[model samples]
Target: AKIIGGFAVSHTPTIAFAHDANKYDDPVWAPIFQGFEPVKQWLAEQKPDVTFYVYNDHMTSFFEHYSHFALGVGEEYSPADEGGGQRDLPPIKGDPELAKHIAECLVADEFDLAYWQGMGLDHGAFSPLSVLLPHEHGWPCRIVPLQCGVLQHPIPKARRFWNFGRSLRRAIQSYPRDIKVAIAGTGGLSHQVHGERAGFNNTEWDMEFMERLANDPESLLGATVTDLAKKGGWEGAEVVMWLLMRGALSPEVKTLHQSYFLPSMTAIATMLFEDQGDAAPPAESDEALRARAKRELAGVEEIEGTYPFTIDRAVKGFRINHFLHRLIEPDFRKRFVEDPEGLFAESDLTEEEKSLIRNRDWIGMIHYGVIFFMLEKMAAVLGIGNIDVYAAFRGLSVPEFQKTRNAAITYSVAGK
Candidate 1:
């Protein structure tokens, strides 16, 4: 994998609201749309396979318990409902394989990142993304979100974020797959939206910040969170997130495009950085990469007839696993027991999945990627004894299998 380029954009919710309200033609909102026009064109031209996004949630998707840094390793993400409702847009696709790889590499690099699946994205991610990427035919590139925690006090230092970007570059470059990747650092130019200092904007500092980010990122690292808060307003401390994007690029980069507009509280800005260096070699050897990948289960694969339910398997079996997991719902379970065929017809299951249930193939379901726990649920729904499924797994009749055990017992993970 290669980091083809980098992007820094403001993620103010006003841009999303303006776009959602279709105010593109309005003079007040046209600058927001105009700023993103070149970015849309750049993406169309570059066509990166994946975009690693660095953004912050506005207490929408993340609240009570949040990590300093969180990575999304799911197959898809829906737009979060921020008061009103989920944006009228299709869910964004995620490159789980790449995300998993990045997570593993970053963990090894001692980033201590928190990862999640089946999470929704707030406007911090959806705002700039909604405009940059065309969604009518679905997003052209998959996204891997790395959400930074800036809402809470005592946030990670600016240098920490810069170091993370350096490690991120290594993670992406070390990926064995041959594909193009882009890095997007979304947030802040300058603005504050609370307290007596409400509606603060500092265009002078915003301009200098962008200049330093593009030309000399290291100089900005000396500024502490308090320094940023004082210079750019309290909330403008988010400008540190931009360093993550700058740090990922080559020391020498050409600015392909740049735009800035402050039509509202936040100073919305956009810029594209084309890395000036050739694609670097993988940071680690294939042998090292493979060894680290299976570090958790070094010898488990040798165990006969064992399946570890790895990330790839989880992604491949997501649809069927989701369907089976839904059996916990009383209504879904009742419908399954009453008319299984009808339920199957309405579900997104494949014919093979329906056939596995129809045949009651306990072991086959396991090989077909259904987790064993789900099989127990299916057995319970059909009024089948746990021993019957266990017997089938071993290719024996219930009585025959019972003889192998010290005592005969029947139980299942089901409720009466």
Candidate 2:
């Protein structure tokens, strides 16, 4: 693999700066972004079609129920309200076809991946993404998100995730696209957020993790989850994201950027790597691939009678959703209300809108968050049927997730 080029940014920047505060403008961050310039240079030089993102969904997405690893298969995507509250953001393009190919191949390779549509991007997507692409309209590239679960104990071991990343590399390298691609792995340099063990930080192991990541990733591929926990603390467990980046590169790679911050509790650090692969290799043939796929997916019995999707929203539903869903926890709720922009650290929202979500007013919901769909879901279920009428009240640029449904506006009267 000769260098065809690569760039990866993590979710820690947004998570730490937005959720925490005053850290981005600090003296330490100066040197951090200084290194980030090479990333800017690379982005200017090589515009990629898609980014393969590996991140952990903060307890909200993969909560108790079906927390299995999932990938979006929809043509469009937006941020989720996640019960804590919603953040102000717009929908980004998604590559359903490419996503489908990844899913099919992974399954064919004996890897069961959960397929999804209409999933939301949280801090995991936005944090690093904001730095990679700061355009207010949101970045233009389509995304293929690969979520891992380090929050739960019994989750995939570090080595297993490394192997999984290896498979993901093969999937993308084998992709039939003429366009360039980037792979990002987001989450924890070192910090814990739950239990009595929470608030842990290991600056010592953070540097060691970076060294191993740069040189001996294969050794990391064999380390146990317990080994990482012992060395980096439970929060440092997120080192698993490194395997994803390691998998995206050749056995040897060049480090473009490396910066670390411990503004709050976590050892927040980021690095950029350039893959040495010559213009990405061509995809495998369809017949041989399909035969391989069929042989692999033979045991997956289709559940034809699956239920339909539903959104049981309210009047200020979007606002309520933004507060509840996007925010999702009491901690998130308290801070957003107390200090909206400070808590949000959002470049995406205006000062006026932050005041509104903080005010907790009804119209503010429509004014600030993606509450239009939430409101339409409630109203349509109550008897309002026309999407145009709902759009008129909401005054949106267009129907949400245009490829999916206007049901956010036209709901089944019988369902709710």
Candidate 3:
């Protein structure tokens, strides 16, 4: 297994909208379409087995609550609308096994990559991909999405990105499969998105960056993050991702094609690189995966009276969880409060689930693997406080539970 080729595409969301609106004939969009034609054709010719896509989420999947250099480990990914409304694109199949393999390799490489099971690909990924595989046959290859942290500060440094790409190459090369994969680093050349200086575009800096990325990536390494932001514009710092594509290739590459266009919003560029001896040995592992799982919850093994809501438990608990979550609505809450048995009968929840809810067995619900969050919702509808829930879990009275907390003043946002 080896990386056969690499591509750098400016992932401007507007590209898809314009294409959908048939605005490619417009002066602003016509060049952008022209710029992608060759890259599209090259991709068809290469027909990579899988695409290791490097793109940043527009707050689609990895939200502010938990954003990481998140990696997609799901079986499939949908095309996200990005708040503009979803486009008519087929679901993208994912290489979960390969993605999981890469995840383990990344951990072994000392890279703490957060893995996600269910996620959708927003414009950052779908836009550029649509241009390459815009047919009814759908995407020709499976995808392994590697998200970059660029939406906010404290993102992976340029040096880290470069090293990530290098490790990524190693991971791909180590795969036991005999397939040629294509790696794509997608983001920007240069453009601003905020403040009075909004809509800023610098073609000179964009072009120079392309040259540096292809010919001398190490040279630009000496520049600081602020230097990149000031010259390339804050949003323009996304170009650092393209350096990842470069790092995946050899010291020398045959630049098969390159294109640049500054339309209205962003400076768009597309470049292709044919790998010139940039291959690493395929990554392999035989160690038990259960060992990793064991290490993840090692200390929890000693915690008394603990039962994890494992995936199997989650699936089994879904009916009750959904029934409880529905009670969030006033109508549903009122129905259950007035005609408890009648409302309960309509649900798909088993008799066991019904009994737990009817008896107000908070501990029983937990033992049944009901998520605490949903239990809190149930507690809210039941006019029960956090102390009551804690007391039930500990098999004690409210006063007894408070004593454990030094009889501290207790209140809850969910208080009646």
Candidate 4:
């Protein structure tokens, strides 16, 4: 895969609200919509197969347990509900295969990266992206999100982010696939939303930041987050993410489009860069690349009857797993036990899934990608002892299976 282009944009929640409220014609909001028009047109013409999104989580999907960098390897991503409710947008499709490949390559490159599945995207990703890409009939291309931990203090230095982009370039270029990919760095153009300096904007530094980002990104690498916050605002420190986008592209790039607007507390800006470097082949051999990608799961396939419940399996069996997992919910469990057929009618499960549950095929469910944990929940809901499920899995009667143990015992998680 090759990076055809790159983009940098601000991700203020104001944009999402303005876009969703249909205030495009309003004088106060027209500039925001107009700024994204050229980007939308460029994307429509270029038609990239995938976009590698670099964004931050604003206390939406992440809280206490947050990593400095997290990559989304899920099959799909829903819009997160940030206090109000989820935005009226269809779930964005994810390229799990490419995401897994990128994650493995980054890990091999010595970046301590965390990966997640079934993660929801907040305005940091959806705000600018909703306007840049046409989502009326679903997103035109898939997305792979790289969530940055900027809200927390002691964040990675600006130079580290630059190196991350360099590694990211290697990861994407080494993929033995013929497809066009775009990079987007979202958030920040100088504004502070908290503290005594609330509602602050610095146009001088914002313009210079964009200029240097386009011409000489190396010059800004020496600056720290504190330096950025002092010039811009505390929240404005997110501009470091743009370096990752710039570093992924050729050192020589031509600005295709640029626009900046300070409509509210944040300075919203959009800029597109066209790579001016020659398209070179991957440095590593296809076999080497394939081998490195599988290093994390090496030898797992050799274990008999053991499935790792990988991303593909999670995606394929998500519906059934969700249905079985919901057994813990009292209302759903009651409905499932009293009127199973009625519950099945309301579910998105396939005929095969319904059959597996109806026949109590514990082993078959495992083969069909249902995680063992969910099966235990289902067994508890059905008032079946844990030993019974174990016997079913081992193809033996409950008594026969219990005899194999040192001491026979009967217990279950179900409440009497």
Best by lDDT: 4
TM-score of each: 0.84, 0.65, 0.71, 0.88
Lowest lDDT sum, 10 consecutive residues, model 4, at: 277-286
Descending-lDDT candidate ranking: 4, 1, 3, 2
lDDT tens per residue, model 3, 131-180: 77765866788888888878777777888888877777767766668887
C-alpha lDDT of residue 29 in model 4: 93
Question: Local error of candidate 2 at 409, Å?
Answer: 38
Cand. 3 Cα-lDDT: 0.78
- lDDT by residue (tens digit), candidate 2, 175-278: 66666677777776777666788777888888888888877888777788777877777767776876766776766778877777676666767777867653
Backbone clashes, each candidate? 0, 22, 5, 0
Q: Distance (Å) between predicted and true CA of 59, model 1?
A: 3.9
Q: Which residue pairs clash within candidate 4?
A: none
Candidate-wise lDDT, in order: 0.86, 0.61, 0.78, 0.88
Better of 2 and 4 by lDDT: 4
Name the better of 2 and 3 by lDDT: 3
Give candidate 1 regions above 4 Å deviation.
63-69, 76-78, 83-85, 113-120, 152-157, 194-196, 220-234, 278-291, 294-300, 376-389, 402-416
Q: Which scores higher on TM-score, 1 or 4?
A: 4
Expressed as tens digits, the lDDT of each residue in 1-416 for candidate 4 is 77898999989988888889988889989999888898888889999898999999998888978888898887889999988889989988898888877877888778898777676899999988888887888898998999999888888999999999987887887777888999999999999999999887889999999999999999999998779999999999999899999989987898999999997799999999997755565577556776887787999988996889877777677889989989989999999999999999998889999999999999999999999999888888888878888899999998899899999998878775
